Structure formats: structure tokens, C-alpha cells
Amino acid sequence: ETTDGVYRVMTRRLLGSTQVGVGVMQEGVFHTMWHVTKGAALRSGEGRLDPYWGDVKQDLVSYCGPWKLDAAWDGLSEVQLLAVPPGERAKNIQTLPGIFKTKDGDIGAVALDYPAGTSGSPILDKCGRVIGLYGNGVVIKNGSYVSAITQGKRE
Amino acid sequence: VDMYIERAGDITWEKDAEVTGNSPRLDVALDESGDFSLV
């Protein structure tokens, strides 16, 4: 019910489902972006996952316990987006991040474009550790997209 | 509204992967509601 892995986040009412995002189950905690769930509870099979920690400024939320993903981009190496697009199987895409330069420091950023419901897909280092989640970013002049590598703090 | 999760795979680095995308160097600001914007 909380087995480790990457998951789709779906919504359904009376008709079919829609994939609104993706997230990571690790160490019994589900990790996704705030804009995917708006910080609301999730169903997993017969069970309920309750929000535990989150921050709208970071655009992150964890379920069942505190944020567990602590790996950091090394600022140097290529990474992989494990993209889980709506209606498509999970695929690994390797890229060298660029940089979001902010007044509070630099953040790695990936220039990869996927549908909105791919939000929350994990970005990985060469050891397979999740160094952040995809989907909070900017649209540049030509209409293409750059996502921050958004990572929480493991307290 | 039923918001629910479904497993979609294992989290593994793929050896010999497709490398793509550029590496843009952008000046951005982040507001208190989580929006990034270009400066």
C-alpha cells in the first residue's frame, strides 16, 4: 500500500480518471508537489494517506511522515528525469541541468517539457537517489520549459 | 472527489540513456506562493 516506487496521482468523479501528477514513495512517506494535490488527502487502494508536512513556497508536500528525500544534485553531473507522463509508461531521460540563479542561491534546473500531469516525477542521480521533483518552473521566450530540481529538507 | 495513487514503476537509473536538452542559465525569482518567474 506504501511500497517504495513511483506512483501516478489520479482524480476521478463520475466518468473517467485524469492524471494530475506523480510522486515518490520512500520510507513509508509519499512525496509530491503541492500543486498536484493542493495538500489534500490521498487514497492508496483501501487506505488513506494524510498530509504531514508541506510548504507552498517550495511547492512540496509529504504524506504519512516528514520529507525523506535528502539527496542533492552535485552541481556538476548529468541527471535523469524518470518521467511518468499521463497515459505513457515511465521513461528515463538523461540531461545536464542548467541553473536557476536566485537571490538566495542557485538551483539546478532541467530543460525538459512534459504535460502538466507529469508534475512530481522524480529526478535521479547516478545512484538512483531522488535529488528532486519535476514540475515547478518557467516558460522561456520560445515557449519551451525549464523545471527547477525541487528538493525538500530532510530534517 | 476521489484523488488516489497507482504504482507506476521502480525508481532506477537507466544505463546508456538518451541525453537531451540544453543547460540554460536563467535569472529567476521565487514568490511566497511557489511561483518562479523570469527576471
Binding site: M33, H35, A116, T118, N136, G137, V138, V139, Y145 | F36
Partner: peptide, 4 residues
Amino acid sequence: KXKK
């Protein structure tokens, strides 16, 4: 983005 098919910014979020």
C-alpha cells in the same frame, strides 16, 4: 509546460 504542455509553468506547472
